[PDB]
Amino acid sequence: GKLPPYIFSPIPFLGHAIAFGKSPIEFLENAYEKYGPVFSFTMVGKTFTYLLGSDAAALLFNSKNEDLNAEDVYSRLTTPVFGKGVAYDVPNPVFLEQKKMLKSGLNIAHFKQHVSIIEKETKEYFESWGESGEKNVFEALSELIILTASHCLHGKEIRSQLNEKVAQLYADLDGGFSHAAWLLPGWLPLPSFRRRDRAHREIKDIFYKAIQKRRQSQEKIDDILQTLLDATYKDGRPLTDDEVAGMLIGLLLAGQHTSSTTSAWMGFFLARDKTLQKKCYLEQKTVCGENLPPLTYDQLKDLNLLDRCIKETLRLRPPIMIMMRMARTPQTVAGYTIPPGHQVCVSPTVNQRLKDSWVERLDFNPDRYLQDNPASGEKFAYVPFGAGRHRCIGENFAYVQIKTIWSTMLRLYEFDLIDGYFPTVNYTTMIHTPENPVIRYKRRS
Numbered sequence: 001g002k003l004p005p006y007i008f009s010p011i012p013f014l015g016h017a018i019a020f021g022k023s024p025i026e027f028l029e030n031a032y033e034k035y036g037p038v039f040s041f042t043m044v045g046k047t048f049t050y051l052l053g054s055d056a057a058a059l060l061f062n063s064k065n066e067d068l069n070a071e072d073v074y075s076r077l078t079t080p081v082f083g084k085g086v087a088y089d090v091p092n093p094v095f096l097e098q099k100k101m102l103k104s105g106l107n108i109a110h111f112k113q114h115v116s117i118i119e120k121e122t123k124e125y126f127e128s129w130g131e132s133g134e135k136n137v138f139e140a141l142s143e144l145i146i147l148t149a150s151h152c153l154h155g156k157e158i159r160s161q162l163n164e165k166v167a168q169l170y171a172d173l174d175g176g177f178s179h180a181a182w183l184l185p186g187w188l189p190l191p192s193f194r195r196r197d198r199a200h201r202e203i204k205d206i207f208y209k210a211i212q213k214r215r216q217s218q219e220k221i222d223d224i225l226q227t228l229l230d231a232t233y234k235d236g237r238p239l240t241d242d243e244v245a246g247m248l249i250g251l252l253l254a255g256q257h258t259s260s261t262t263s264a265w266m267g268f269f270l271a272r273d274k275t276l277q278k279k280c281y282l283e284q285k286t287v288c289g290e291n292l293p294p295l296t297y298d299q300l301k302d303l304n305l306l307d308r309c310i311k312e313t314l315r316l317r318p319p320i321m322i323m324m325r326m327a328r329t330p331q332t333v334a335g336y337t338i339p340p341g342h343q344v345c346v347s348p349t350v351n352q353r354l355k356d357s358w359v360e361r362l363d364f365n366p367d368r369y370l371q372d373n374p375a376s377g378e379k380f381a382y383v384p385f386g387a388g389r390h391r392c393i394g395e396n397f398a399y400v401q402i403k404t405i406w407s408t409m410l411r412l413y414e415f416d417l418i419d420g421y422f423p424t425v426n427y428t429t430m431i432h433t434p435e436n437p438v439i440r441y442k443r444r445s
């Protein structure tokens with residue numbers, strides 16, 4: 001029962017924290033070459049064991065939450081933002097129930113309603129961009145994504161209350177997701193903390209009103225909000241006003257930053273490979289018609305090249321770079337026994353560009369999925385939405401959203417790099433943002 005190899009700390013307490021913080025990918029890539037798929041190292045006195053490659057990563061994804069726990073690591077950051085009675089503030093079984101309730105809401109019935117809602121929001125927002133110019137796509141996409149997601153996931157009522165004030169409250173909640181948050185004690189009266197806690201109560205209060213309103217209302221509506229109001233547990237109890245508010249927050253936060261960054265990154269991949277962008281525009285005609293009519297849900301499924309362009313983006317710029325668990329009990333993989341207390345980590349980013357399993361691993365060639373490839377070839381080579389009991393329930397809504405917006409965007413504009421600059425990765429944010437993400441655009445044909 002041998003432990004995995006341990007990369008000895010160069011610095012006593014800090015370990016490899018400095019080195020990791022600059023280029024964590026590069027770090028993990030070197031770590032693989034020199035130590036193999038299973039190894040342990042230290043940052044700020046905490047031991048992490050990393051599982052690189054499908055075979056190893058399998059351990060994390062296959063595991064029960066009893067054994068490799070997600071709350072043990074996530075609870076302290078989420079509970080203060082999402083709120084009580086939801087996500088990691090409850091046993092995993094209760095979460096898995098809440099996940100079904102959320103999942104049911106995300107069906108073909110609602111995906112149809114959404115496409116038109118998202119197309120409309122997309123056209124109306126990109127009025128302000130004029131006929132051409134140079135503007136930050138990321139800033140723009142983030143602002144658009146919150147409105148779409150709120151309209152779609154919350155409803156028109158709650159979407160109608162979305163003034164720039166409420167936008168800044170949603171940012172103040174997101175400020176709750178910081179390196180400071182998990183590095184420093186919660187009892188430090190930090191601005192970011194206090195703005196999170198303030199923004200929480202104020203947003204809960206907004207949802208409390210909108211929920212009461214809907215329940216009283218004779219009004220029957222088939223949207224996600226109602227899915228949750230009507231839904232029940234296995235016991236037969238329905239959700240509380242607070243449980244619902246909690247999940248409405250999680251929904252929006254989940255939706256926004258994952259999609260916005262992903263959307264922003266593609267926009268620069270497409271801006272670099274003009275050949276591919278052209279095909280992506282001509283696909284729109286070829287699938288929807290030469291007249292470019294209002295997008296419908298069933299048209300989405302036929303957008304193979306766009307779908308593959310997204311897939312290829314999440315491969316190279318997955319928004320959630322690392323998923324990690326607390327080891328509660330021993331866990332064996334590749335002849336190694338990970339002891340309790342270790343923080344077991346997996347990297348979609350590393351797994352999705354491993355030289356040994358990826359031909360031309362740095363390249364953005366979305367056609368790599370039209371032959372044998374690790375996505376369909378390997379179990380856990382491709383996991384931008386994860387796997388097992390903690391896997392994403394928002395994979396479909398995400399694609400719907402990213403397709404519709406960019407479908408509408410391609411139709412509206414042609415995009416290009418500025419002096420042939422391609423954004424490098426800014427590792428300083430929680431979700432890695434593109435360094436200087438301003439793009440050149442102009443009216444399409």
Ligand SMILES: O=C(N[C@@H](Cn1ccnc1)c1ccc(-c2ccc(F)cc2)cc1Cl)c1ccc(-c2nnc(-c3cc(F)cc(-c4ncncc4F)c3)o2)cc1
Nearest residue numbers: 009011012013014042043044045046047182183184185186
């Ligand atoms: O950094 C601390 N603890 C963790 C870090 N942490 C805690 C929560 N989140 C992060 C910590 C503490 C030590 C180590 C560590 C690991 C490996 C090493 F080789 C050395 C230290 C690793 C960690 Cl993670 C920390 C640990 C201990 C103290 C602390 N606790 N008690 C003391 C202390 C100080 C004193 F002046 C006296 C005494 C003391 N205690 C009992 N009786 C009489 C006494 F005088 C205790 O210091 C203050 C901070």
Ligand SMILES: O=C(N[C@@H](Cn1ccnc1)c1ccc(-c2ccc(F)cc2)cc1Cl)c1ccc(-c2nnc(-c3cc(F)cc(-c4ncncc4F)c3)o2)cc1
Nearest residue numbers: 073074077078087102182246247249250251253254255258
């Ligand atoms: O972004 C998170 N959760 C999201 C994930 N998401 C987004 C879309 N799909 C999944 C999240 C997860 C669930 C939900 C949600 C929404 C509605 C619901 F009804 C239910 C869930 C919403 C969101 Cl935004 C998230 C949750 C927890 C953490 C976290 N907590 N602790 C840490 C942490 C702790 C550490 F000790 C170290 C580190 C750490 N981080 C980077 N580098 C090195 C490190 F050591 C991070 O990270 C970080 C991120």
Ligand code: HEM
Nearest residue numbers: 251254255258259320323384385386390391392393394398
């Ligand atoms: C690009 C878009 C998205 C990506 C890449 C993404 C990625 C992920 C990943 C990797 C996980 C696994 C987390 C882990 O293993 O610890 C996850 C979990 C989850 N995601 Fe997403 N997600 C996206 C969008 C969404 C959306 C739109 C929603 C809801 C509307 C959502 C809701 C969730 C939920 C509820 C979980 C479960 C967390 C858990 O069980 O611990 N996600 N997502």
Ligand SMILES: C[C@H](CCC(=O)O)[C@H]1CC[C@H]2[C@@H]3CC[C@@H]4C[C@H](O)CC[C@]4(C)[C@@H]3C[C@H](O)[C@]12C
Nearest residue numbers: 014017018020021022024043044179180183427
């Ligand atoms: C290692 C994480 C980054 C994790 C990530 O990249 O996702 C970062 C987040 C906070 C960073 C800490 C900030 C406080 C310190 C900043 C100093 O200038 C040198 C690094 C120190 C001692 C820490 C080192 C390390 O750089 C940390 C712990």
Ligand SMILES: C[C@H](CCC(=O)O)[C@H]1CC[C@H]2[C@@H]3CC[C@@H]4C[C@H](O)CC[C@]4(C)[C@@H]3C[C@H](O)[C@]12C
Nearest residue numbers: 013014017043044045046179180182183184185
């Ligand atoms: C000791 C100073 C106070 C000195 C002063 O303010 O002049 C305090 C203030 C901020 C504290 C730092 C917080 C970041 C880090 C928290 C980690 O858990 C490991 C200890 C670190 C690396 C530092 C611990 C140390 O206790 C510091 C540096």
Ligand SMILES: C[C@H](CCC(=O)O)[C@H]1CC[C@H]2[C@@H]3CC[C@@H]4C[C@H](O)CC[C@]4(C)[C@@H]3C[C@H](O)[C@]12C
Nearest residue numbers: 013044045180182183184185186187188189190
């Ligand atoms: C207590 C942790 C040490 C990290 C840890 O052990 O978890 C660190 C993080 C921030 C540190 C604080 C720094 C500012 C505070 C005033 C002084 O300028 C230093 C002492 C105080 C009252 C705190 C001292 C203490 O050392 C703290 C709270």
Ligand SMILES: C[C@H](CCC(=O)O)[C@H]1CC[C@H]2[C@@H]3CC[C@@H]4C[C@H](O)CC[C@]4(C)[C@@H]3C[C@H](O)[C@]12C
Nearest residue numbers: 044045076180181182183184185186187188189
């Ligand atoms: C380091 C933590 C707080 C930061 C953290 O939670 O990480 C601080 C906050 C409360 C501090 C305790 C105060 C009571 C005690 C004070 C004594 O004179 C000797 C240390 C003791 C036993 C503890 C010292 C230690 O420094 C603690 C535990």
Ligand SMILES: C[C@H](CCC(=O)O)[C@H]1CC[C@H]2[C@@H]3CC[C@@H]4C[C@H](O)CC[C@]4(C)[C@@H]3C[C@H](O)[C@]12C
Nearest residue numbers: 076080181183184185186187188189190193194
């Ligand atoms: C900040 C720490 C613990 C961390 C926290 O939860 O904030 C708090 C918790 C209990 C507090 C201690 C209790 C005895 C002391 C008198 C008060 O009866 C409370 C504050 C004093 C001065 C101590 C210092 C510090 O205020 C402590 C140790």
Ligand SMILES: C[C@H](CCC(=O)O)[C@H]1CC[C@H]2[C@@H]3CC[C@@H]4C[C@H](O)CC[C@]4(C)[C@@H]3C[C@H](O)[C@]12C
Nearest residue numbers: 183184185186187188189190191192193194195
């Ligand atoms: C959080 C601890 C003790 C826990 C508590 O507040 O109950 C408190 C006790 C004393 C607090 C510090 C006192 C001076 C600082 C300015 C204010 O003149 C008082 C709060 C500030 C901002 C600091 C906040 C910091 O967090 C401390 C050290």
